[PDB]
Design a protein around this ligand. Sequence first.
Ligand SMILES: OC[C@@H]1COc2ccccc2C1
Ligand SMILES: OC[C@@H]1COc2ccccc2C1
Ligand SMILES: [Cl-]
Ligand SMILES: [Cl-]
Lengths: 136, 133
Amino acid sequence: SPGIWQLDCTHLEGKVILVAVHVASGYIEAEVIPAETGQETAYFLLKLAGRWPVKTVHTDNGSNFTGATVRAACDWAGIKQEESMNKELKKIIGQVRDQAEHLKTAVQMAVFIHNHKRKGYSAGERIVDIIATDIQ
Amino acid sequence: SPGIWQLDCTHLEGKVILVAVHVASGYIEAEVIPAETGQETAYFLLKLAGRWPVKTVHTDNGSNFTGATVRAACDWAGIKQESMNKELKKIIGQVRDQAEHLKTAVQMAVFIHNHKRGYSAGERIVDIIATDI
Ligand SMILES: OC[C@@H]1COc2ccccc2C1
Ligand SMILES: OC[C@@H]1COc2ccccc2C1
Ligand SMILES: [Cl-]
Ligand SMILES: [Cl-]
């Protein structure tokens, strides 16, 4: 389904990365966040939902999903709750880590490479095709 | 034209907001940044280009575009530098009180702008890009 995303966390270098995958396409949005808290998780969900039509997010249901602020953000945005990438994404982060001072910039180089890679169609072309198909 | 974006800056509450508009659809990505510098601008362009197929960005050509780091980010990403805004500050206005931080109001405003509807800016951008594919 076009509105279904999976959010997972991954840790690198003492920092927390949130990785959202659009399940049907393999497109990703990812960010380094200062801490895995309710407030940061809510803000990430708000940003994601402002950019793509997010109906359902599959999460690990952990501690940063149980609070008032996340619940409020999901409610406000119209979002409901209901494997390879974390490792591949880390592999690309690995490949590019030295070219940037900051982990955040390496992570965004990795999002770029992941979504443009053509192995065919890229994940970028796949997401837009599946959503344009749904609108029509 | 599907790969053409316009980036501008706007200032509110002592902070700097970067607003990228996909010119053919009116779809926006926007962020609050800690300063209008070469490094923050290059990182914003890198994020944008990893999410949407950005071929050309129209900028104001100011100081934060003249440096080594922006030039490098645009080169690396394949970007060249050859209405949907005033509304934004007005939506930020409407939602400002519901968020402690300006950043969260700006992202409420991006959501509202892109979802408002016979098509939203979100539907228009995906229609335009799917067609070009
Ligand atoms: O009422 C929830 C709104 C919209 O989403 C967020 C996200 C993070 C922090 C605050 C809020 C307020
Ligand atoms: O060498 C350019 C790359 C890709 O983009 C950015 C953006 C900000 C800072 C460094 C870099 C490295
Ligand atoms: Cl998480
Ligand atoms: Cl600017």
